[PDB]
């Protein structure tokens, strides 16, 4: 009965962090800041919280507990949290039992949110019995204490004790780590077994018999369908593709787990599902709205069965159908398809509102298009009555405004933004829309022509009219002539520099940057997102010397020894390049002595691994003719060799890293080999360089219509970008050729350069967006061909480049906020543009005396 429901969680299947950084009324990424106090705590307990984590520990006396064993987890609903911890803790205290709980409301929310890990979900209190006897004792006593409480979210990783909120599992009591994996437990033999935390209960081999014991005293409306696959999982439940048996109707089954998957409004899976069901009933006769089949409870979960709509959501449609490639004259078909979709969508929103319901999240993900471009809307979990001025549970940044107050108005605003989006699929937030509205409309007009432009403006104006019926709303003026593109590279560099100069933080970060300034180690100080990137870039432009010197002297130097990673982009080495150029020779020489020691190990990437470090080391060897640095480079090479022999498969730490290309993949490793060749003349390093590129080229795909080569990842995604994409591959080919005097991979090179024909990218940044394309002209030696390529990518840059006062600034990832870092902001754009001037496709690398590096590594 219940085993069938739970098994659903086992089936196979096929950036949200930005929200936490939209502190209102800032133009930058800035954290939004947000309590289980218990009293009468005996002195036999020590009470502390985690370094950076969710748990408040209650450690008893001076006892030692086993390093693994049978542990108890307790679950509670949010409204019952304080009341459940009171009864549970004051039991454990009064029995001298070690336990922990989630430290505050925020933590509870984070761990039980819609997108929280399914394994970790529901675990509010963790209890650590000293041995198996007190374990089984506690099962009964805790459950006796909490019986008169509402059932909380089921913990998918545990077995439940009877019909209580008491759950149990065997795993690590402490965190026991290894060299290739996470949390582990000990065996009876080769004690290296991995602690399994999955969305289903599992038992370590060597304690099965005790689980067998535990099972002793431990006390179909859905069988109508063949549940084929799971389209998606969240903490709130699964969404499954099914076929109704003896009928063969494809349906969508949407699962809600009671008390699980909270949102910002503290609404659970069931609360949202009911809203979706109510909405779909009210819209039974609106043919554009997906139709509900049936609604039933099976075991404890609730199941909303739904028409399966054949086609693609507008995100997929955009990705696959938008005419990204400039093939010379031919965007008229797009114009046709966009009009047909949008005019359908206008009528659909009117129909929904006529029935008194706003859909609540009008944005590409929820709009589907059939093969003949019929428009349907799915996902009514966000539905509200039109006219309601309730705070929405969720906002899709990119298609919302805080200026919207009424639910009906929110739909029209999203549509309004959707209208321009299909014409230029480039994300923006309300915070930068003030600026980028000009960039986008100007682009649409120059590229589609006045007719289509006026279709867009008119339709957006009708949206305005629609909003005005719901609330007071009066949008700003137009006048597109106020915004002009720039095609003068020096001008763009100089104005972006003034931009940076005008946005210095007087804090430890030096500049505003990507959220990774906050989310990652060294992020405030390193080259990638930290102040070293900007300070380096400003130094190259002889700008802000006094400000740079002060940040170095008073922040960077005291932080340098304490940055634990040596990574080129993420850690010490990138910083040391800045330091050397700035004259701090003594400081650099000292850090180099430590460098052979600490963490010369498994990561080989340019970003954070041995290649990047080695590449820095080689650059330092070229600058100082100190042979110890060549020796060290050689040592790093052998260690890369060792790593490759242990296993070819690369590990990614960053959620946007892909194990191909120059940043995180083998193409990057080849840069180091190429450079090592330049300084040794050892042919063998040249061979390795070439072999590494070859291996990456195996993960590329040529389009048949367009001639463009891109990389293809492990989810069949095509990539152009410097990070993960073919432009980075091209750069390594270029450098291979630069150091050897050859012209290898001419064919691949030529088909990568064709990326300069790209009309738009969803984001603007050097690594993951438009800025990547600025690297293309820097790899073209012929002046005449360069000029055409440069103009094309400058058209692309001008979609992102913001005029603010009389200087330029640059949007960060997804253009939600501004950034001035190398990774996403103006610093990386500057370095790439300076690269174009200098014919240098490596100029974005923090190498020692980089203005000399090409000349010094030339064949
Ligand atoms: N009625 C339907 N017909 C066809 N596909 C559907 C239907 N309802 C949902 N889907 C698709 O099933 C998948 C999972 O739906 P779910 O609501 O869980 O979205 P999700 O995983 O959060 O994805 P997204 O990031 O697109 O919101 C999505 O690709 C969604 O578009
Ligand atoms: Ca959805």
Residue numbers in the entry: -29 to -16, 4 to 23, 29 to 213, 223 to 862
Original paper wording:
The kinase domain phosphorylates Ser or Thr residues in the peptide substrates. Subsequent β-elimination by a lyase domain yields electrophilic dehydroamino acids, which can undergo cyclase domain-catalyzed cyclization to yield conformationally restricted, bioactive compounds.
Reasoning that heterogeneity in the stoichiometry of ThurKC with bound precursor peptide may contribute to the poor crystal quality, we generate a single-chain fusion of the ThurA1 leader peptide attached to the N-terminus of ThurKC with poly(-Gly-Ser-) linkers of various lengths. Nonetheless, these experiments show fusion of the leader sequence to the ThurKC lanthipeptide synthetase yielded a constitutively active enzyme that could act on peptide substrates without a leader in vitro and in vivo, as has been demonstrated for a leader peptide-catalytic domain fusion of class II LctM34 and the unrelated YcaO heterocyclases involved in cyanobactin biosynthesis. The single-chain LP-(GS)7-ThurKC fusion yielded easily reproducible crystals that reproducibly diffracted to resolutions beyond 2.5 Å. The overall structure of LP-(GS)7-ThurKC resembles a cupped hand with the lyase and kinase domains forming the fingers and the cyclase domain forming the palm and thumb. First, clear and continuous electron density can be observed for the leader peptide corresponding to residues Met(−22) to Asp(−10), and this accounts for all but the C-terminal ten residues of the leader peptide.
